[PDB]
């Protein structure tokens, strides 16, 4: 047999656990919920990285829907609550695909039911609206970990693609990791800066996580990883789970997009301008300069190192799928996963590597929040700390 085929039978017994996708966003976007057209249970190829046939054929059998909302706009609560209101309406659509989980338990039910675990994550610190009780009440709806920032600072902690702010987590954040580590929420340091990924690690006495961050080493760009962070997640039992985003994982990718970005600006527009007239611009450089093409071989170098440094036991994947516009050959949707695992398995991975990396370290880290968690429930009460108090 294959490499590939090798892989499938691989997935069939250690399925993937992806940290992170963001099919609910597209949801909004695309079809203000409009489940119906946009069916999972139906061929969604031509508008959608996600599909329930897809999935399967990639061999995921656990998908941390990430419930992002946008920091830039208000009403991110009940944006939130409508995120969650998406993830659940689709395990309830499709109870003989997907299966809810709340617990490390949970996942393991759904692995032998040969149904996906269909668990959540918020995707940025936002979503909480500086209150604690708040943050309670989604980890009563369901949620298992917070990204601490999205793409901009709040008003506790600095995110990894905006100025410096408070320099990591302000008090206040610490506070906040805190009663993560409380309930049982798993604290993701995708998205921050260097200095936040620090002052979490300090904080929490629980695994955290990167549910969608590669190799800052292999590719400098700030939404990787810097090695001295990954050489402390052995001590701190988390794990980092690699992502796909070309011009996060290919220096080509990530040096032309620099390149694109500025030649924005040459023309007088912010980079994230997304007008008519901002459009030609970028075309036209694009025309002039084709856009670097990243492969599964590129997203390999990234877990060969992270592997190296942290440490098999302290890996997973979460390829960011429906979440960016852009994807590395062979890894064109939910059905790539065993193109990945194929070429790991070419470059002298073993089995027992590969199922850690799929299923055992994520399983391992859920249950580790949820053992921390019972300790410090039983130790102490909720905190009732405002922002104003402990930031001033
Ligand atoms: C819209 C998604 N929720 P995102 O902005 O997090 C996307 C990617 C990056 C990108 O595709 O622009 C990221 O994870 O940093
Ligand atoms: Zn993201
Ligand atoms: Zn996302």
């Given amino acids: 047999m294959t490499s590939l085929e090798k892989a499938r039978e691989l997935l069939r017994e250690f399925p993937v656990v992806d940290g992170h996708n963001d099919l609910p966003w597209?949801?909004?976007?695309?079809?203000?919920?409009?489940?119906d057209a946009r069916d999972i249970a139906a061929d969604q190829s031509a508008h959608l990285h996600t599909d329930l046939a897809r999935l399967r054929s990639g061999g995921v059998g656990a998908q941390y829907w990430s419930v992002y909302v946008r920091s830039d706009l208000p009403g991110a609560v009940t944006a939130t609550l409508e995120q969650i209101d998406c993830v659940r309406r689709l395990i309830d659509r499709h109870p003989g695909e997907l299966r809810a989980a709340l617990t490390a338990a949970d996942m393991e039910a759904a692995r032998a039911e040969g149904r996906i675990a269909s668990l959540m994550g918020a995707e940025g610190g936002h979503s909480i609206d500086n209150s604690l009780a708040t943050l309670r009440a989604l980890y009563a709806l369901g949620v298992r970990y917070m990204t601490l920032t999205h793409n901009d600072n709040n008003a506790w902690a600095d995110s990894a693609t905006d100025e410096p702010g408070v320099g990591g987590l302000s008090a206040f954040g610490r506070e906040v990791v805190?009663?993560?580590?409380?309930?049982?929420?798993?604290?993701?340091?995708?998205?921050?800066?260097?200095?936040?990924?620090?002052?979490?690690?300090?904080?929490?006495?629980?695994?955290?996580?990167?549910?969608?961050?590669?190799?800052?080493?292999?590719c400098d760009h700030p939404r990787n990883i810097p090695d001295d962070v990954l050489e402390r997640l052995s001590a701190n039992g988390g794990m980092a789970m690699?992502?796909?985003?070309?011009?996060?994982?290919?220096?080509?990718?990530?040096?032309?997009?620099?390149?694109?970005?500025?030649?924005?600006?040459?023309?007088?527009?912010?980079?994230?301008?997304?007008?008519?007239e901002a459009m030609k611009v970028?075309?036209?450089?694009?025309?002039?300069?084709?856009?670097?093409?990243?492969?599964?071989?590129?997203?390999?170098?990234?877990?060969?190192?992270?592997?190296?440094?942290?440490?098999?036991?302290?890996?997973?994947?979460?390829?960011?799928?429906?979440?960016?516009?852009?994807?590395?050959?062979?890894?064109?949707?939910?059905?790539?996963?065993?193109?990945?695992?194929?070429?790991?398995?070419?470059?002298?991975?073993?089995?027992?590597?590969?199922?850690?990396?799929?299923?055992?370290?994520?399983?391992?880290?859920?249950?580790?929040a949820e053992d921390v968690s019972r300790g410090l429930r039983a130790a102490r009460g909720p905190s009732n700390a405002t922002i104003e108090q402990l930031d001033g």
């Fill in 26 to 35: 597209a949801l909004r976007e695309q079809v203000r919920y409009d489940l």
């Fill in 178 to 218: 805190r009663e993560m580590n409380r309930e049982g929420m798993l604290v993701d340091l995708s998205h921050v800066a260097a200095t936040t990924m620090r002052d979490a690690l300090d904080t929490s006495t629980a695994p955290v996580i990167f549910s969608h961050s590669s190799s800052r080493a292999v």
């Fill in 242 to 276: 690699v992502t796909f985003v070309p011009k996060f994982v290919l220096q080509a990718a990530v040096d032309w997009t620099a390149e694109a970005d500025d030649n924005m600006r040459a023309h007088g527009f912010h980079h994230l301008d997304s007008s008519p």
């Fill in 282 to 368: 970028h075309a036209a450089f694009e025309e002039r300069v084709p856009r670097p093409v990243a492969t599964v071989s590129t997203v390999a170098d990234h877990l060969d190192h992270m592997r190296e440094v942290a440490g098999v036991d302290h890996l997973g994947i979460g390829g960011d799928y429906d979440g960016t516009p852009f994807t590395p050959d062979g890894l064109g949707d939910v059905s790539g996963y065993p193109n990945l695992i194929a070429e790991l398995l070419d470059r002298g991975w073993s089995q027992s590597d590969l199922a850690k990396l799929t299923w055992k370290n994520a399983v391992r880290v859920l249950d580790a």
